[PDB]
């Protein structure tokens, strides 16, 4: 006691940057009459310290003056969450009776001494969240009584010691955040009591040991973010107690093992980000407990099995970024608990099944870049729980106002590159949480419902490449949160509303290829974030307003194919960031202002088909201009 | 992906009172569907338009993970901290607009690797140091501005800076 307490008191002297408010103020009297009862963090047995608990004590120092020789009876040591720096001395293995060893969350460096292997009585080993480098010693396999080994979040290298098969009592192996190398020892598959194996986020090469079929007690197998190769061993199906299997972000090849159906407890399967090929085994429909099924970003082929209808508890089905084909079986959306259905980047065909939102809980549906056709199922129209909908790049058809209902929780929708006809329903206004409405390249006619502007939360609106008619109201100001407005390629007519002035958060304006007919608003001088403005192919009929030059941040400004007349104001020199200018196909007269030579950012100009004259100012843009950039003028020197 | 995780690092080191970065959903494959971010046909981020966003915080070294990023607009905010030298990893690059901020520290010499750079505006800041010689080797720099900043040393005309005007170096306390 007195020898132990004085030795601890000497070790405490090593501590640096220690405040008088520390918990170790109780270390005053070395007599057992205060050592074993009033000293914080120590607990004795038969008068001798067996327990040292100094977690989260803010101690700053090293274990160089740790009294190894003075504390024979230590069995519990937890020095985690402190500022200990240095190495792990081999003297740590001298604690014969030690059962619990925790040095996690520290600033330790160096290797793990093999002397830790002679801690025969050790049950738990925690060396977590440190910067220990080197290979795990083979001698760790000597810890026959160990049950949990956690050395993750470190800088460990080399292979896993195949002597780990000798750790029969091990139930929890945590080594994930590290740089372990080489193949997985086959002996690891022969741990009888193992329950959790987390080898993820490493540099592990080679195949997955077929011996893993013997782990009938394992419920968690995390080995993602590795360089594992070969094929998934079919003996994995014998892992009948598996709850979560994650091999994502690997270099696995070959087909999915049909033996995965035998695991009736598997609720999470993450096979994505790999190179598995072939067809989906119909036996995957027999994985009864499956909740999260992710096989995305692969090279799978063939159709989805109709057996997927037997997955009655599925919630996430990730099949995107693959080479699957054929029709969608109605059983895919059989689940009433389905919430996420990602299918983009595939080669599917045919109609959507009427079971699409059977349970009324679908949130995120993704169908981009496919060959779907036919109408939207009535179950999708009435499915109010949608959040993200992505129909982009298909051949969907039907009346756009008859296809979709109301969606109070809708956030993002993209129906671009489809064959939807009809006029826009005013039902979209009730999607008060919508921030991105993108419906470009369709066959939609009619006018924009005035209620669309009462959707104040919109930040991106894209109705481009359609046949929308009518004129934009001065109520356009109601969506001032917008930053991308793409209304180009339509039959919008009338004057451009002056309410565009008040959309100050606007970044990108595209009103081109339309039938706007009167003069540009002279009040458009307050767009401090606009870097794009395309007003080309219209009928604007007067002089360019001076207020346009007050938008300092334009990079591109296209006013081509118009009826603009008058002289090009010299105040365009103020646009210091302007890179592109297109004023072609107009009736602009006068001389090109020679103050344009001072616009260093300008690179591209087109002034063709106009009524200007005089020698052009000399800048980088005018010099490299081809002969097309000056065609059809009057007297350009 | 990689680019989306990189931009997510920025999102966590900035205070966003105006909810500008709200659309930046980390669980998406790419950040190309985010607002204020634009990609090219390859789904690589090429533009970040965060000017006048009332963003306070510190820059992030993950900004060098955007190989195709051409235009970086962080101007007109209350961002503090230093400029991480890792922005020199932006192989393709046109515009660096960091002006009108509260940035401090030196100007990293690693910006000389951005040989495609055309416009660099860092004025109205708290920058301190000297102009690297490396910035004279870009040969593509057209517009330059380091006004309203306490730097030191002489104006390096090493060849490229010969075309520039004292307005680029006004109120700089250089000479």
């Amino acid at each position: 006691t007195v020898e132990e307490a004085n030795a601890l008191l000497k070790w405490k002297s090593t501590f640096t940057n220690q405040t008088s408010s520390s918990k170790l103020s109780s270390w005053v009297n070395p007599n057992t009459s205060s050592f074993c009862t009033s000293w914080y963090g120590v607990a004795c047995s038969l008068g001798s310290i067996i327990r040292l608990n100094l977690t989260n004590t803010g101690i700053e120092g090293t274990f160089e003056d740790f009294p190894f020789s003075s504390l024979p009876n230590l069995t519990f040591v937890d020095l985690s969450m402190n500022r200990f720096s240095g190495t792990i001395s081999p003297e740590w293995g001298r604690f014969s009776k030690l059962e619990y060893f925790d040095l996690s969350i520290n600033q330790l460096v160096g290797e793990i001494p093999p002397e830790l292997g002679k801690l025969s009585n050790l049950d738990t080993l925690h060396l977590v969240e440190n910067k220990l480098n080197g290979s795990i010693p083979s001698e760790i396999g000597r810890l026959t009584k160990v049950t949990e080994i956690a050395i993750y979040d470190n800088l460990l290298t080399g292979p896993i010691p195949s002597s780990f098969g000798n750790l029969t009592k091990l139930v929890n192996l945590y080594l994930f955040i590290n740089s372990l190398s080489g193949s997985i020892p086959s002996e690891i598959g022969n741990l009888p009591n193992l329950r959790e194996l987390c080898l993820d986020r490493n540099n592990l090469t080679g195949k997955i040991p077929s011996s893993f079929g013997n782990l009938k007690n394992v419920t968690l197998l995390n080995m993602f973010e590795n360089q594992l190769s070969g094929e998934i061993p079919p003996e994995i199906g014998n892992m009948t107690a598996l709850d979560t299997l994650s091999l994502h972000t690997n270099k696995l090849t070959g087909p999915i093992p049909s033996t995965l159906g035998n695991i009736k407890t598997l609720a999470v399967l993450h096979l994505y980000l790999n190179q598995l090929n072939g067809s989906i085994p119909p036996e995957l429909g027999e994985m009864e407990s499956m909740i999260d099924l992710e096989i995305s970003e692969n090279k799978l082929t063939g159709p989805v099995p109709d057996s997927f209808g037997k997955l009655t508890a599925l919630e996430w089905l990730f099949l995107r970024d693959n080479q699957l084909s054929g029709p969608i079986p109605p059983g895919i959306a059989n689940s009433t608990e389905l919430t996420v259905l990602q299918l983009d980047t595939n080669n599917f065909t045919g109609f959507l099944p009427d079971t699409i939102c059977r349970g009324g809980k679908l949130e995120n549906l993704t169908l981009d870049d496919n060959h779907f056709e036919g109408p939207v199922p009535k179950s999708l129209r009435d499915c109010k729980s949608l959040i993200r909908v992505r129909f982009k790049g298909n051949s969907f058809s039907g009346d756009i106002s008859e296809a979709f209902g109301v969606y109070p929780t809708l956030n993002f929708i993209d129906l671009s590159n489809n064959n939807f006809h009809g006029q826009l329903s005013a039902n979209w206004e009730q999607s008060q949480k919508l921030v991105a409405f993108i419906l470009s390249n369709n066959s939609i006619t009619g006018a924009i419902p005035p209620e669309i502007w009462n959707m104040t939360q919109l930040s991106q609106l894209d109705l481009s490449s359609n046949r929308i008619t009518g004129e934009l109201p001065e109520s356009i100001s109601n969506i001032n949160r917008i930053s991308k407005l793409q209304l180009n390629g339509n039959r919008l007519s009338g004057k451009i509303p002056s309410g565009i002035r008040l959309l100050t958060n606007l970044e990108y304006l595209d009103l081109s290829s339309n039938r706007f007919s009167f003069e540009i608003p002279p009040t458009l001088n307050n767009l401090p974030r606009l870097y794009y403005m395309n007003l080309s192919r219209n009928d604007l009929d007067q002089t360019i307003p001076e207020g346009l030059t007050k938008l300092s941040q334009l990079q591109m400004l296209d006013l081509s194919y118009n009826q603009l007349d008058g002289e090009i104001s010299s105040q365009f020199r103020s646009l210091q960031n302007l890179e592109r200018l297109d004023l072609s196909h107009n009736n602009l007269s006068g001389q090109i202002p020679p103050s344009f030579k001072d616009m260093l950012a300008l690179t591209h100009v087109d002034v063709s088909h106009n009524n200007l004259q005089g020698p052009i100012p000399d800048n980088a843009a005018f010099r490299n201009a081809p002969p097309d950039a000056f065609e059809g003028n009057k007297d350009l020197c | 992906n990689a680019e989306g995780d990189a931009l997510s690092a920025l999102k966590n080191s900035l205070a966003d009172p105006n909810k500008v970065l709200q659309s930046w959903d980390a669980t998406l494959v790419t950040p190309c569907t985010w607002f204020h971010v634009t990609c090219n046909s390859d789904n690589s981020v090429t533009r970040v338009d965060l000017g006048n966003a009332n963003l306070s915080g510190q820059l992030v070294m993950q900004l060098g993970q955007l190989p195709n990023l051409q235009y970086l607009e962080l101007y007109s905010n209350n961002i503090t901290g230093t400029i991480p030298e890792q922005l020199g990893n932006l192989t393709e690059l046109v515009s660096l607009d960091l002006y009108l901020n509260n940035l401090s520290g030196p100007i990293p010499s690693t910006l000389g690797r951005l040989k495609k750079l055309r416009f660099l505006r860092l004025n109205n800041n708290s920058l301190s140091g000297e102009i690297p010689r490396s910035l004279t080797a870009v040969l593509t720099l057209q517009v330059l501005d380091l006004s309203n900043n306490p730097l030191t040393g002489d104006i390096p005309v090493n060849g490229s800076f010969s075309l520039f005007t004292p307005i680029s170096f006004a109120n700089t306390k250089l000479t």
């Binding site: 969450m81 969240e129 956690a150 993820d200 979560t244 999470v268 980000l273 | 992906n1 998406l28």
Partner: peptide, 13 residues
């Protein structure tokens, strides 16, 4: 301390 690793969900479009 000790804790397991959580396989994070895949991405999305």
């Amino acid at each position: 301390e000790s804790s397991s690793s959580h396989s994070e969900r895949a991405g999305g479009r």
